Amino acid sequence: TIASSRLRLLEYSAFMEVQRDPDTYSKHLFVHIGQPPLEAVDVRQIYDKFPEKKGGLKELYEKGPPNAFFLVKFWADLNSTIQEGAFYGVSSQYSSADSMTISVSTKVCSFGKQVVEKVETEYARLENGRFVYRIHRSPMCEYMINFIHKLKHLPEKYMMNSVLENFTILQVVTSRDSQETLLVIAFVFEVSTSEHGAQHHVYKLVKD
Ligand SMILES: NC[C@@]1(c2ccccc2)Cc2cc(Cl)ccc2O1
Ligand SMILES: NC[C@@]1(c2ccccc2)Cc2cc(Cl)ccc2O1
Ligand SMILES: *C(=O)CCCCCCCCCCCCC
């Protein structure tokens, strides 16, 4: 469970979907976090992998609160399980006890430098006593689709992991009005090698 004192990540999944005929659709999940204590990772170990200087991970952690910082290790399923005009997208859902407008910023980094940034504003929906935020079928940018295609063309999974050693995604969720940090999730990737498919391990980012 990825949750700070103000916001909780309920679900997250990146996928590709194909239309096999007018009434048939296939969907392949690359990564997924669906709906206990976490092991810790020192945030200083990953500083070099994210953009630093103004608005960087170090400045974000220093600004606080520390309870909002998480690291997700993903083992993405890049096996061609469906035959590919496919749609590549991301779906996620968050929740809070307070009604607020959020801003979800996703920074894609390559060698610690930001190459793509997507910003989406989400409005609170009152649902079962709590406030829910849904980003449904958010399309992937061409940079990411072309990156997945290029990894899928490497003949070995250890080659894909070598490339992915320099690829990270930083997700920062802030309160739109106050600009307060609600949730920060650093994503690191490897390619899945088990018949169980895509895997994930969540950690809490700490300092000492
Ligand atoms: N141009 C070669 C490289 C690459 C190689 C094989 C498969 C996919 C991509 C190396 C690389 C690292 C990152 Cl982090 C992002 C993009 C990227 O492009
Ligand atoms: N290659 C190992 C690692 C990893 C292992 C298992 C699952 C996901 C990712 C650890 C790691 C840290 C960073 Cl900053 C960037 C990439 C990265 O890849
Ligand atoms: C905007 O394009 C952000 C898209 C974030 C995609 C999440 C990546 C998870 C899909 C598997 C890729 C793993 C190796 C790149």
CATH number, domain containing residue 66: 2.70.50.80
Resolution in A: 2.7
- How many alpha carbons lie under 13 Å from residue 1 in its C-beta half-sphere? 9
109, 169 contact by CB (below 8 A):
yes
Q: Whose CA is nearest to atom 4 of ligand 1?
A: 163
Domain count, the chain: 1
- Exp. method: X-ray
> Residue with the nearest Cα to atom 11 of ligand 2?
188
- Quick one: tokens of 102? 């959020």
Q: Is 18 in the pocket of ligand 1 (CB under 6 A)?
A: no
Number of helices (H), then strands (E), in the chain = 3, 13
Instruction: Specify whether the CB–CB gap between 176 and 182 falls below 8 A.
Output: no
Which residue has the CA at smallest separation from atom 15 of ligand 1? 110
Q: What residue numbers bound the domain in which 42 lies?
A: 2-206
Q: In whole angstroms, what is the distance from residue 19 CA to residue 180 CA?
A: 41
Q: Ligand 3 pocket, 144 CB below 6 A?
A: yes
User: Cβ(17)–Cβ(87) under 8 Å?
Assistant: yes
Can you tell me the distance from the alpha carbon of 16 to that of 84, in angstroms, rounded to the nearest whole number? 9
d(CA 202, CA 48): 20
